[PDB]
């Protein structure tokens, strides 16, 4: 319960471990100390009886070495994780990994290991098995969440009822390797040495040590323990322990041994002509999800039954097999039952609805996890190659728990050289040789920047029609690119979502030169990515995007000139691009607009709050703004303000949202059940965000796309910010921070704080001056901060490392957070002849995994910023800001940003919900916001529908089938991914693709709803909407529990409600 690791009190640095080893011998029992640490010293004892006796002697205060007293304090983190309970440390056991081969009582002994040291750790929730395969030692650790079922087994004779203990895993263990340095053993106390049993060496994560790779291809661990008197262990401490002991007999698992370093959990080549894109992937998906066993899919019966039957029914039956949460030990029986009890548009929907059925694969450190076809937003590559959409595969590299791969897993990081571990080599080998799910071999083609951040890789099966290399030829990569950075940029440019604007003539594209100052040594270009566009081209681009207004600037990727282009009414050339926007060469002379300039609501971040506090904004100022935010959030369940205060701006909802529709012209949020539940979900999301990432909205502030003034009027330290006034801002206008330009928009006149999204170094917070230019009408910039054309240094450049390639700048006129003084900024300062190879791109991906994520670097900066007197100007914080800049620049220079141990957060703020880390209270630097958030958190309508929304007699009742079909589809989606009882598009938002899986059934319902409507439409569309409302609300006692079927036609329902209210 304490791990016997006692944090020693103040001790001198001139202390010998052998001295304390022998001194403790004269004070406690003989050889009764396990481990010892001296840098805040730690001593681990053998048991909890020898511990609490030193504490008893510590309370007696007798122990005093030399002239220094010892105050043995509370138990800190374990020096070496060992089970203090003598019984929990099981040694010399027989461990066999396998799967139940679809019988629930027979086990595939894939590989048997003898001498396994099973350490069942409760405080640190993990059971670590120490194996000794070959000549090296490996540790197999389950995580107490891997175990979905622990069973009491009887593998040998029935004389002993309890002989083995099964450990059914759902994610798969993390395998480590015993690697030593053979260095001097003393090192005073040393970190892992001084142990009684010589627990030296390091534990680096590696792959399946078994030649047969039995660890990966096994979903269960069997622990043949010598004694069955261990009921107390392997009990409710191990999750899901049934008391019903099962008789388990071993079977030969030699037929499932695969030596392939890729995809160790797939079916063998025992298929004649079976289609792998629709069964083998789905069968392997079932095996990985453990819905059926590996022998359940490799058996002749199921293979022959699926081969004989139709493919569409096969997809349906395999999906239904994947539906149930238990392990189907009789997939043949399930398939036969669904066959006998069968109860009897087009795949190219991405060309129209921009949604693909992608077959993603999470490649863990030692296992493959195929996840079948899943609906996500389509990208340009599949948009072009929809003929082979089933040949794509979104390969993601995870850490055996569907979590992000740690840098420690892929790199060792007391070491002389950063030697990459076996996980990095495995990822490189998989990216090279590809994933082979049967006949289809998925080999790497390219990845996106977000995919790089998400550790996701696309792989194409080399179909006979088009090879996986020809698509790379289409995308323009690996053709003539010379640098890995620009190769990755070109690869990612064709994956990010965008809108295809008008095709632009190459002759109409002017090339206006860049603006560079080149002062103070650094070469700084003012027009780093900002271009131009004519007003006519702007209007046609706007209507191409889908807007009725002309945005000030568009973030574009036209050809290779990636950047943002502003609307100049003086400009007559169509596109007037620049050289500084060039990233790669491309003949695709057509605009690809990602996002335009809109007045996106502002919201602070923990990094922005940290820097503003460091520059001199008191914590009592942020707390007041968060108090206003929490006041706005508390009454959203009880006031109509949520229509234009929470959903409109705090969340991603807009004027076309259904909740906004029924709140702008509807009743209170708590009146309607669907409205109340969706508003409660939004409330939970906003509170969780504000508690995690302090998105404190500033009404006097807007996050705006950076832009440059194309005329020389704006000077250094001066910016132009003309923003369309919000409704609340329209109500309270004509202030010192604004002046009326039009009936709708106003330009800031006062001081403005400007910083980029990362915003980690004190100095990116720039207190610029918002000035009104007499040329506001001539150029008409809107919802975009206008950086000066000339000056000592470009303002986005001194905003950390920002530039006008579409980077959004945090701009707020709110005087409360505007610093009195601004810190002077950081400096923010190779075409190898070997060209770009596929292996080089794989190495770039691997090294990006080596580099620590921007999120963890920002979190560590927060940790080191919440205690130091200089919050962000601290040496730790400045060095880690430089490291964060290196991590951002990794997309340009492939040097991983390995955060050192000195910069690692030893103890984490209470604001960050890091339960594994040792938390310290953070009442110093705006940690009061978390406490305020917690304090704020811890402070049918059928008749109404039939009256004010269903006045016209519908009497259709055709929506009952939809409620039994679309409701069935929603229940299927909830069973597949969801966990709550929500039936709306936010079902998975408790979410990356749940809004895509959902809102498609509603889109299917919308198609189904109009299909059942014969159109006028008052007798068809309104009738169907009223029938759905009556089916859901009036018969809510039925077995539907949806409350969202009428919301699929919710626009029509709200229109009918307004029409009935208009007639009244
Ligand atoms: Mg940028």
Residue numbers in the entry: 7 to 45, 56 to 360, 368 to 436, 440, 442 to 856, 861 to 970, 980 to 1030, 1046 to 1070, ...
What does the paper say about this structure?
pmcRNA-dependent RNA polymerases (RDRs) are encoded within the genomes of many eukaryotes and function in gene silencing by converting single-stranded RNAs (ssRNAs) into double-stranded (ds) precursors of short-interfering RNAs (siRNAs). In plants, transcriptional silencing via siRNA-directed DNA methylation requires RNA-DEPENDENT RNA POLYMERASE 2 (RDR2), which associates with DNA-dependent NUCLEAR RNA POLYMERASE IV (Pol IV) via direct physical interactions that bring their active sites into proximity. The coupled transcription reactions of the Pol IV–RDR2 complex yield short dsRNAs of ∼30 bp that are then diced into 24- or 23-nt siRNAs by DICER-LIKE3 (DCL3). We report the structure of RDR2 and experimental evidence for how RDR2 engages its RNA templates and initiates transcription.
Full-length RDR2 expressed in insect cells using a baculovirus vector was subjected to single-particle imaging using a Titan Krios instrument equipped with a Gatan K3 detector. Successive rounds of three-dimensional (3D) classification, 3D refinement, contrast transfer function (CTF) refinement, and particle polishing were then conducted using RELION 3.1 (26–28), resulting in a map (Map 1) with 3.1 Å overall resolution. The higher-resolution RELION map was then used for model building, employing Buccaneer and manual steps. The N-terminal region (amino acids 1 to 360) of RDR2 begins with an N-terminal domain (amino acids 1 to 100) that includes an RRM followed by a β-barrel–like domain and a four-helical bundle domain. Following the N-terminal region is an active site cleft composed of multiple domains termed slab, DPBB1, connector helices neck 1 and neck 2, DPBB2, bridge helix, trigger loop, connector helix neck 3, and head, respectively. The three highly conserved aspartates (Asp triad) required for phosphodiester bond catalysis are located within a loop of DPBB2. Extra density at the position of the three Asp residues is seen in the RDR2 EM map, likely corresponding to a Metal A Mg2+ ion. No Metal B density is observed in the RDR2 structure, but this is expected given that the RDR2 particles imaged by cryo-EM were not engaged in transcription. Examination of the electrostatic surface potential shows a positively charged surface, starting with the RDR2-RRM and continuing along the cleft and into the active site. However, an intriguing difference between the enzymes is that RDR2 behaves as a monomer during purification and upon imaging by cryo-EM, whereas the QDE-1 proteins were crystalized as homodimers.
